[PDB]
Symmetry: D3
Subunit: 173 residues, 6 copies
Amino acid sequence: LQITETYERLRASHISRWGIVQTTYPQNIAEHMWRVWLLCRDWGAAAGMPQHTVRQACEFALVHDLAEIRTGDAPTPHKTPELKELLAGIEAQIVPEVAELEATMAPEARELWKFCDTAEAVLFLKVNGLGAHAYDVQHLLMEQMKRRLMDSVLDVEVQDELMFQFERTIKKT
Amino acid sequence: LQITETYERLRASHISRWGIVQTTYPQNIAEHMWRVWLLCRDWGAAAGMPQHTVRQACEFALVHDLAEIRTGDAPTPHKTPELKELLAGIEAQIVPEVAELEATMAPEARELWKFCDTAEAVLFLKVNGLGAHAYDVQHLLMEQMKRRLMDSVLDVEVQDELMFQFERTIKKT
Amino acid sequence: LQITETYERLRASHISRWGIVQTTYPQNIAEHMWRVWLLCRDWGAAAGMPQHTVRQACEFALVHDLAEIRTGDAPTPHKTPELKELLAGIEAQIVPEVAELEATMAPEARELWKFCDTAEAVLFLKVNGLGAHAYDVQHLLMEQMKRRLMDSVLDVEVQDELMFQFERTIKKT
Amino acid sequence: LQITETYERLRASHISRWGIVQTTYPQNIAEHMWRVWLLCRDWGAAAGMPQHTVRQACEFALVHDLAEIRTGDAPTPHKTPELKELLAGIEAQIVPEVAELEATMAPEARELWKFCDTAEAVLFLKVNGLGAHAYDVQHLLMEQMKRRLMDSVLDVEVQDELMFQFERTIKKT
Amino acid sequence: LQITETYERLRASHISRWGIVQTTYPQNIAEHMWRVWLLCRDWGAAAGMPQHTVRQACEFALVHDLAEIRTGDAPTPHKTPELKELLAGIEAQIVPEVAELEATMAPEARELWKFCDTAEAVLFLKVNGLGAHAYDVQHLLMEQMKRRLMDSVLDVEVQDELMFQFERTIKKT
Amino acid sequence: LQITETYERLRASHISRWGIVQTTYPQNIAEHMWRVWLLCRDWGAAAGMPQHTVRQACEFALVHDLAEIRTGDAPTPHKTPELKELLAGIEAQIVPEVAELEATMAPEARELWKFCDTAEAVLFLKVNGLGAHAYDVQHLLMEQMKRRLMDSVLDVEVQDELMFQFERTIKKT
Ligand SMILES: Nc1ncnc2c1ncn2[C@H]1C[C@H](O)[C@@H](CO)O1
Ligand SMILES: Nc1ncnc2c1ncn2[C@H]1C[C@H](O)[C@@H](CO)O1
Ligand SMILES: Nc1ncnc2c1ncn2[C@H]1C[C@H](O)[C@@H](CO)O1
Ligand SMILES: Nc1ncnc2c1ncn2[C@H]1C[C@H](O)[C@@H](CO)O1
Ligand SMILES: Nc1ncnc2c1ncn2[C@H]1C[C@H](O)[C@@H](CO)O1
Ligand SMILES: Nc1ncnc2c1ncn2[C@H]1C[C@H](O)[C@@H](CO)O1
Ligand SMILES: [Li+]
Ligand SMILES: [Li+]
Ligand SMILES: [Li+]
Ligand SMILES: [Li+]
Ligand SMILES: [Li+]
Ligand SMILES: [Li+]
Ligand SMILES: [Zn+2]
Ligand SMILES: [Zn+2]
Ligand SMILES: [Zn+2]
Ligand SMILES: [Zn+2]
Ligand SMILES: [Zn+2]
Ligand SMILES: [Zn+2]
């Protein structure tokens, strides 16, 4: 069950996202993780967050979905609290090193990562989603991203910078 | 959570299989279910199974993966007994009519359907799988299909006809 | 010429539709037939049509394009009366069992199937058509579907239910 | 019915070949016609055919499938003599200028074009065909190409040069 | 370095355009060159340009990007004067016969070809571009095409006919 | 010319590799950079290289191809010394921060990165290359990778560990 080999980790590019949403092509988790990393790096800096916090978010961004090489990527609405509890234990056996990183993340780093993880998905669908359901999902994700950010421990000035940058970015995407 | 609308059921063609395996294109569950239906129809008849049994397998084949419109399609190795128990309850809320059909299926109809469901996957990868992992998955599925068939309640003559037809079919695929 | 083998019938998923129209991906006839079957099942029931009629439409839906495994799928405008007459004889040699089903279909079952066959195509292009020609084809098909329905033997109440459901479905597609 | 507009002729790149054969992507008739043109140019010259003959083959190569913008591309085995007779009249209404060119082609130019048209298809499948049926089609086409060439009016020395070049080309494709 | 073999020239269909722009699929240079050829043929005739000029533009259209089989297709904004000077020498070694044709082209033939080369790209993106950057590129190309045409040696009546036909064509694409 | 905005950097996933090689799909530079990063991380550690060296290789891996968002990805054989000299100056204006990182890299970090950059390409083609040219490119890259490694400043024990891991990985890919 545990992922221990580079040949397995390389299969990040074989793991397709958006399994219940029509898209122009099957996005893989490697391109997703790179883009989330980029957002954490750029937007963490734009928001003036401490370097140690941005570094932690970026480190997690690059590995956070590796368990999906075994589990597959499952749709957000399907990940209820009960399923997430079961998946957390399974994922900790698959990638214990990722579980350890997740357990060490500071709340501010976690909230930067989560904002960027959802933002990347909205940005992806803006270009590559097809049809009414995909459009609804894009907009639902954007609402969820904003609600989570607003209720988070991030300072309001940081929240505002993240939304400033998100909106500038999506307009040009 | 429950799927009640035709516009949702049409999204069977938006649900991608093989989320952890490299393939030439993203196969959807609609084409999968049609092909499983075809195999149940043709191979149930070739094996001389009673018409009522073949009909039940075929009816289930056409709807059996509909819950994935909500849950996504998850990889076989990930569906452990504990996860399947949780998924069974969730899936019964998503598509109660499919759960009712599953609970009424005769063992012989279930075993025909399961053979055909796995055979379809092997046949798909024979053409459309890419790389060493996909090749291994194709062959693992074929071994699992044979083991399940051999240990099933189907008469040995039926088992042999199903394997006769499977092998003739894959040679020409 | 006759299709007699399961390995050939499985090639339904190798037969590409929309050969003269730009689309986001090549839809095959297996996913098309599954979706037409679904529409016949759901919309026949919504319209209160007799169970025997809906069953006949659904049975035909699952096999109706099998001859295309040999002939290819040809564009609707190209299928003039003279070509259709020639194709009918060829198709009857390719899939005599499908020709027999077609010759037994009740008019109401035929009109349900034809409505759903065209509706599926409109719905597909709504999501997956690309460019001005594809848009025109989508809208032409919708006009043809409505005209055929209005001139059909189906009761006006059935016609209205079919259009009610079609319009609700396409809005959400 | 007649194609008269550049916007319609540009849809050559919207017309997909291989409608009954699994391929890695949907090849269009524009890339096909360019490649057939290239083969006529290069192999006609290699074979020492008169410039006027090579020019005629090349001119036809660039337009020969334009009627498919209306008719679709249909599979070779389906084009029986009776269907071809009907299609010839339809195609002459669609693209009268192409029909006029075809009626003026010298036999040697026609045989160069036909060799190259089939060779291009073999070469395409060598790279992009998927599965056993596609492999069989590739090899059937190669046999048909050779038989037609051997029975043609082309001098044996020309036949041999065409096969010399075909075999060198496919080895490196 | 020099391209001398048909198997290499056939790789025109392996050379992907739009390497920095999101598109629905990877357009190759063979389909591009066919479409540019078509535009030169049709629009040169519509504009009443001399047959010898249209022929020269068409001949160049069919081969003009062959060096990209070695160099790759590079984005227009990246091709600065300094890079183009270096590329011109490299391309002349790759395809000396294409360089010779380019050096013989009459200015009016060159301007017809260049208009059509850019028009084809705009028309392609109209259908197949995805996202805001692709939209901007489509519109930038259209502005560049118009500016080059207006400043060219082509008579104003020819310029107007080319724009008349371009606008009619894109409206229907 | 300079890339300064997150919306531009996100277009890493819009930049297609393998522009002159047939592949099953268009790989983008984001998935490439993630995979190169992974190889640097895993294989640098397996080889016992100092943490500071592996970190530097990994940092560069994640950004090293960003200039291609403007320049496009060009084929290795085309990047002659003269072209690389010109590109180095252009790329330094596009992404000065990447040029600064490149100029600070220790030789051992550079050689780890270069090994992994080429290995990733071989591994990609092993799964996704199509046809004889792609096969030749895969094997040429593997020979180039080995020659560069053997002539590098890396200790022989490090070279051997890198080849040990590469060969184990490709066998399972
Ligand atoms: N509302 C939604 N409906 C369907 N799919 C969704 C939704 N939100 C996110 N996703 C996708 C994105 C990833 O593939 C996966 C979560 O990482 O789920
Ligand atoms: N061993 C396996 N590894 C990865 N994927 C697999 C395996 N077996 C089946 N599948 C896929 C097929 C369906 O998408 C889904 C089950 O219906 O899982
Ligand atoms: N007006 C039209 N123009 C082009 N293609 C069309 C049109 N109507 C239907 N189709 C397609 C759908 C199927 O592939 C096939 C008929 O089943 O034709
Ligand atoms: N034996 C065959 N089976 C299936 N398809 C075939 C066969 N031969 C040619 N083709 C395809 C190539 C074009 O799409 C079209 C003829 O131009 O038919
Ligand atoms: N402004 C632009 N940005 C990005 N890509 C562009 C632009 N203009 C043209 N192209 C593409 C089309 C061909 O692939 C190639 C030139 O033949 O460059
Ligand atoms: N020999 C070769 N022929 C063609 N393409 C090649 C070759 N080697 C590498 N590549 C590709 C990989 C990247 O897209 C790009 C370099 O990063 O060039
Ligand atoms: Li999807
Ligand atoms: Li997959
Ligand atoms: Li199409
Ligand atoms: Li095909
Ligand atoms: Li692109
Ligand atoms: Li490529
Ligand atoms: Zn994620
Ligand atoms: Zn199934
Ligand atoms: Zn149909
Ligand atoms: Zn042809
Ligand atoms: Zn060009
Ligand atoms: Zn690189």
